[PDB]
Amino acid sequence: IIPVEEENPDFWNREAAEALGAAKKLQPAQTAAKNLIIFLGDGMGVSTVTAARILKGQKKDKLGPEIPLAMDRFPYVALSKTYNVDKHVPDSGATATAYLCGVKGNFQTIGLSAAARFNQCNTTRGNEVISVMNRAKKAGKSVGVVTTTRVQHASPAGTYAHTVNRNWYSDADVPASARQEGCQDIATQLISNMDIDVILGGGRKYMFRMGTPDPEYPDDYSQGGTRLDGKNLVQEWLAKRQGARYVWNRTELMQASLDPSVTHLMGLFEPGDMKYEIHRDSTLDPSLMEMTEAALRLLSRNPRGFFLFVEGGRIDHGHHESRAYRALTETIMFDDAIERAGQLTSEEDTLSLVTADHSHVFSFGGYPLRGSSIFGLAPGKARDRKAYTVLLYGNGPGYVLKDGARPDVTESESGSPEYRQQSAVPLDEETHAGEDVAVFARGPQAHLVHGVQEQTFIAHVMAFAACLEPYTACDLAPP
Amino acid sequence: IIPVEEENPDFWNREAAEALGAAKKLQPAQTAAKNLIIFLGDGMGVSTVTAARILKGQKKDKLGPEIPLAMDRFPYVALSKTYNVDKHVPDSGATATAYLCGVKGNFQTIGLSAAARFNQCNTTRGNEVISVMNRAKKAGKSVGVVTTTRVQHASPAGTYAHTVNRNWYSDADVPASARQEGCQDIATQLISNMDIDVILGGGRKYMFRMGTPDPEYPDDYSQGGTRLDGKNLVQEWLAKRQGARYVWNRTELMQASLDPSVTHLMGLFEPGDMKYEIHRDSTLDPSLMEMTEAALRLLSRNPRGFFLFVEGGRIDHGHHESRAYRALTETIMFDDAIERAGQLTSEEDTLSLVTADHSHVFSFGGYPLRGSSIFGLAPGKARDRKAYTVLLYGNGPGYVLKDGARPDVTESESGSPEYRQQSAVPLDEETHAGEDVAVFARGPQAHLVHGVQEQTFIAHVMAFAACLEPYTACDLAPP
Ligand SMILES: *[C@@H]1O[C@H](CO)[C@@H](O)[C@H](O)[C@H]1NC(C)=O
Ligand SMILES: *[C@@H]1O[C@H](CO)[C@@H](O)[C@H](O)[C@H]1NC(C)=O
Ligand SMILES: [Mg+2]
Ligand SMILES: [Mg+2]
Ligand SMILES: [Mg+2]
Ligand SMILES: [Mg+2]
Ligand SMILES: [Zn+2]
Ligand SMILES: [Zn+2]
Ligand SMILES: [Zn+2]
Ligand SMILES: [Zn+2]
């Protein structure tokens, strides 16, 4: 459809004039950041951002591409180079070391320099690198970790953990020789390495000993406790703190967040990762936006400010399944959380960065008309005389042959939440992609995020802006 | 391979410190731009940029991803939204109207508002929108158009032409009813609409009457003149100017560019589009970098400054063929031309923008090791037990079935210049993609290119910066 307002040049000339005046109005900060927030859309490359913008605009009553996402209103943008030291297409662990610790690492390791080697416990010590969240804590700030995946998953773990193997969620995953050598599982590192004021997401099962029934799924033994050492890490965390609370459902999270006297909050909403937003039980589980508001209610009480990590973690999972509906709906909730955090914090004293750890081999093609659904068929038939979708993958589990040929697809099929877009190469899981991802910034020192930069820049500008990490001697005025 | 220097955190901490100091050193321009250059990588989306950076670094003796492209050193970056008014995944013509005229249009039309309709000659008049190159000419600047495609192809045509059908290269392409109604073919509009000081690229055949032998291929009749009206448009162009020269090969281009007394130069190097750089005859044809230096030698003589369009036009073609080797080598020469132009102009008085008109469904995946060739196989076999490449397409002509199954691929095969990467859907030509593309800027007012902007912003910031278009009353000091 062609909207009549856009047929007149003046529509476009007035828009661009407004754009110019807005651009001329921005000026850089001479002041420090009191608060730091990093919003991490896992797997949210440029193709993800544009497809999610279109979907979100159509959910409003619009055509799509013209309606800005919340992240699109951030004034400063840069491109970020993701390669890990050893591999050109990276994983979450080693990217986490770059954007949270400011050092690049080897694929599937977390919080370690590239002198460490994957799955080699004896190459850990002497290679630990410290996150900017650890440093904000050393400076007296309150610190929070919010995600839709397990809180021991790779991205959140980069804020507090140091490990040669991202798969060591609990001690049951760690080989006996590594346990003997002292390589602690990630759930142990979550309660032990540093003090974290707010911990919210999935991963209840790695905190309790084998045999402990899950509170939400007591009739499903596979959702129970995994530990081999008999420990209850939630209770050990709770015991070192006055005013600490543990929550496992939405109603207790929200009540706890309204209670001064709480001060420390661990909220573990599912045994493993949280449900995709389209499968969320809204009586039992908090959305990503609700977790981020809950975390901000607590974190904002500290007069010295806070550090907050907020992850749209299952964007990535949707792409691995080659189910763009799942990846795009998770991206819209992630943008909704960014908007919410923006309403609860001031850009005068809060540096907010939105980025992705890496991308996916996800593409938006064909030549669909303005206003058409993003999960639709491309206009016209392919060379094998069958329909094809505007959304596709390079590789992944949507590759299918039926009697030696590519299957035809209907519009009713292609718009289903379980639909897997086709790919050129069959893989159990679609792969990450190595192209640069965007960085969106606002707040004190956000104008330093510019151009084309290594992914370690994200960590370094946050520390500089709050005058942490190796940057006290920042030349900044108070927030 | 893991480079030993990168195993030490200090490598990364020193790099980021340097990055911060550089970022702190930039300050905006209070002055106008004397010169304007727009570098247009046709089809050069973010995935193209990163794969081309890796290839270019490996051509030097490096690992790849760490080595900056010339475009990567531009201080200011933004994301650009490409949709056309009527279609979410755009074409070159209507994107050209947005980035050269500052108004969005309908797919496959050029220089017209969206009140015009594709292939409907009777919807042209009253809908013409003027380019910033036309306005720089009205202000007394010298103007140049340089490209590797036909100079009548969609992108260059956006600087001077107004048409409901980008396919009307010569009068032979225009239906008789449209000729009668006055819709002039693009080759006629090139010499007639406005005065252009330098015209360099392909498209010799549309300038001469049917029967005229091509100078470079006199023994191939299909490369000869196409016109139905008996005109010789090169001679008609040459006749209105004192000091105009026509050239068809490299040696005469370069000599003409060294001669004051020349002043107007039309250089048409191939009948249709120019050869890909890997097929270029270096005695007969100038590279993209040589055309841009030749154009700058002439354009720079004017004391009032110049406008210059420089297109890496066959990047796009390489992607349509699903031959990433062709798309990436054309991208490296395009970056080489950007570097060259940077050496021949000052950022103190020249606003330079690098962008793409849109992207392609091209992806860089698998999990290849650091330093591995970009045209290589991904580590490990796919679910059908056969190898797969790191580079793939969503759709396009690389889809193949041999006896009902996806073909295996060897490293010798995948590194060939004719190799077509596999795709999920067979199409004669791979499709454009609709995701946002990058904008890179340097020079006076370049700091106004920021954030997430509509593609019309490119045109509008150039006019503002040189105080043209609807922006005299710019509040800028002289360059
Ligand atoms: C770690 O143990 C393995 C297996 O015994 C051994 O090969 C390697 O050399 C050890 N490395 C260090 C860092 O001591
Ligand atoms: C252009 O001509 C076609 C064919 O006769 C006609 O249908 C259309 O209405 C005409 N349009 C204008 C703009 O007059
Ligand atoms: Mg993650
Ligand atoms: Mg739950
Ligand atoms: Mg072009
Ligand atoms: Mg030639
Ligand atoms: Zn990830
Ligand atoms: Zn992933
Ligand atoms: Zn194009
Ligand atoms: Zn194209």
* Residue of A94, A203, A102, A114 whose CA lies nearest to A432: A94
**Quick one: DSSP state of residue A277?**
G
Is B107 in Cβ contact with A367 (below 8 Å)? yes
**How far apart (Å, rounded) are the C-alpha atoms in residues A377 and A386?**
10
Q: How many CA atoms lie within 13 A of A25 on its CB side?
A: 7
Q: From the list B382, B433, B470, which residue is nearest A365 (CB)? A: B433
Quote the CA–CA distance of A408 and B175 in Å, as a whole number.
Answer: 37
Please give the Cα distance from B58 to B369 (Å, whole number).
13
The CA radius of gyration of chain B, in Å to the nearest whole number, is: 23
What one-character-per-residue DSSP string does A381-440 give?
--TTSS--BSEEESSSTT---BTTBPPP--HHHHTSTTPPPPBSS--SSPPEE-S-EEEE
Write the CB contacts of B325 (distance below 8 Å, at least 6 apart in sequence).
B278, B318, B375, B415, B416, B417, B419
> For residues A292 and A37, what is the distance between their CA atoms, to the nearest angstrom?
11
Tell me the two tokens of residue A456. Answer: 């370690």
Query: CB-CB: which of B98, B364, B451 is closest to A433?
Result: B364
- Residues in chain A within 8 Å Cβ distance of B425: 382, 388, 392, 406, 422
Strand residues in A82-174 grouped as ranges (E): 142-150
- Tell me phi and psi for residue B405, to 5 degrees: -145, 160
Q: Are B462 and B132 in contact (CB under 8 A)?
A: yes
* Tokens linked to A395: 């590789």
The residue contributing the CA closest to ligand 1 atom 10 is: A122
Where b means 16+ CB within 10 Å and e means fewer, B408-430 reads ebeeeebeeeebbbbbbbbbeeb
Q: Would you tell me how many other CB atoms lie within 10 Å of the CB of residue B120?
A: 13
Distance CA A254, CA B95 (A): 48
Query: In 3D, which of A351, A336, A243, A338 has the Cα closest to residue A306?
Result: A351
Distance between CA B100 and CA B203 in Å, rounded?
21
Identify the helix (H) or strand (E) that includes residue A95.
Answer: helix A92-96
Resolution as reported, in Å: 1.8
Q: Residues B55, B332: contact at Cβ < 8 Å?
A: yes
At B190, phi and psi to the nearest 5?
-55, -40
Provide residues with CB under 6 Å of ligand 2: B 122-123
Which residues contact residue B292 at a Cβ distance below 8 angstroms, ignoring those fewer than 6 apart?
Answer: B146, B308, B310, B337, B340, B341
Structural domains in chain A plus CATH codes: 1-479 (3.40.720.10)
Alpha helix stretches (DSSP H) within A263-353: 288-299, 315-321, 324-343
Chain A hits for B74, Cβ within 8 Å: 451-452
Q: Are A37 and A345 in contact (CB under 8 A)?
A: yes
Q: For ligand 7, an ion, list residues with CB under 5 A.
A: A 42, 92, 316, 357
Rounded to 10 degrees, the C-alpha dihedral B335/B341/B342/B347 comes to -130
**Cβ proximity of A134 and A122 under 8 Å:** no
CA angle at residue A26 from A24 to A30, to 5 degrees?
140
Is the CB of residue B320 less than 8 Å from the CB of residue B169?
Answer: no
Contacts of residue A77 in chain B, CB cutoff 8 Å? Answer: 77-79, 450-452
Q: What per-residue string of b and e applies to A358-371 under the rule 16 or more CB within 10 Å gives b?
A: bbbbbbbbbbbbbb
B455 residue type, one letter:
Q
Distance from CA of A256 to the nearest CA of B (A): 37
Catalytic residues of B: 92
Q: Which of A200, A199, A198, A195 is nearest to A137 (CA)?
A: A195
Query: Which tokens belong to B306?
Result: 């110049």
Let me know how long chain B is.
479
Residue A100 DSSP symbol: I
| A85 class by beta-carbon count within 10 Å (0-12 exposed, 13-18 middle, 19+ buried) | buried
Q: Judge whether A175 and A119 are in contact, CB under 8 Å.
A: no
Integer Cα distance of B50 and B320 in angstroms: 18
Region of B40 on the Ramachandran plot (φ > 0 left; ψ -120 to 50 alpha; else beta):
beta
Element (H, E) at A24: helix A9-25
CA–CA dist A366, B172 (Å, integer):
29
DSSP designation for B419? P
Residue A123 Cβ < 6 Å to ligand 1: yes
Residue from B153, B40, B231, B141 nearest B469 by CA: B141
d(CA B115, ligand 2 centre) in Å: 14
- Residue A119 CB–ligand 1 contact under 6 Å: no
Contact B198, B265 (CB under 8 A): yes
User: Cβ A47–B392 below 8 Å, yes or no?
Assistant: no
| DSSP letters for B180-241 | HTT---HHHHHHHSS--SEEEEE-GGGGSBTTPPPSS-TT-GGGS--BSS---HHHHHHHT-
CA–CA distance from B371 to each of A108, A153, A397, B61, B367 (Å)? 18, 28, 28, 10, 12
CA of residue A346 relative to chain centroid, distance: 22
Task: Note whether B389 and B366 are within 8 A (CB).
Answer: yes
Judged by CB atoms closer than 8 Å, whether chains meet at A365 and B394 is answered as: yes
Q: Is B143 helix (H, G, I), strand (E, B) or coil?
A: strand
Question: B327: closest CA among B39, B55, B37?
Answer: B55
Structure-token pair, residue B144: 């140049």
For A380, other C-beta atoms within 10 Å of its C-beta total 10
Q: Are A18 and B448 in contact (CB under 8 A)?
A: no
Q: How was this structure determined?
A: X-ray
Report DSSP state, residue A153.
S
Residue B263 backbone zone (phi > 0: left; psi -120 to 50: alpha; other: beta): left
Q: Are A335 and A56 in contact (CB under 8 A)?
A: yes
How many residues make up chain A in this entry?
479
Give the integer Cα–Cα distance in Å for B96 and B156.
8
CA separation for the pair B44, B285 (Å, rounded):
23
Q: From residue B405, give the alpha-carbon distance in Å to each of A136, B381, B384.
A: 55, 15, 9
B23, two tokens: 């970022």
Beta strands B35-41; B306-312: pairing state: parallel
Cα of A157 from ligand 3 centre, angstroms: 9
